[PDB]
Structure 1
Amino acid sequence: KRPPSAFFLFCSEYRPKIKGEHPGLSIGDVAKKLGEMWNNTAA
């Protein structure tokens, strides 16, 4: 159901970067980082 898109793959691939490089915070900071990274780069 609900076939994902390029952004969902971006999330599922680049969230573990911040989840393993800085595990001291919850994935709220990881989402915030991934979002400020996507907004600064292209698609």
Structure 2
Amino acid sequence: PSAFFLFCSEYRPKIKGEHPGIGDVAKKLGEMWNNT
């Protein structure tokens, strides 16, 4: 388990309740993990 490991799923529902899909949901989550 790494940062993105426990960051792609722990914050997954925060976009999965908006994005039905499951790449596009965590996609912008990767961008907000990269910005920081």
Distance 2:25 2:5 in 1: 14
Number of residue pairs the alignment of both structures matches: 36
RMSD, matched Cα: 1.7
SS at match of 1:6: coil
- 4+ aligned runs moved over 6 Å, structure 1: none
Higher normalized helix content (fraction of residues): 1
Calculate the TM-score normalised by the size of structure 2. 0.66
Calculate the TM-score normalised by the size of structure 1. 0.60
The answer for unaligned runs of 5 or more in structure 2 is none
- CA deviation digits over 1:1-43, x for unaligned, max 9? xxx122211112111100013337xx221121111110111xx
Q: Which has the greater radius of gyration?
A: 1
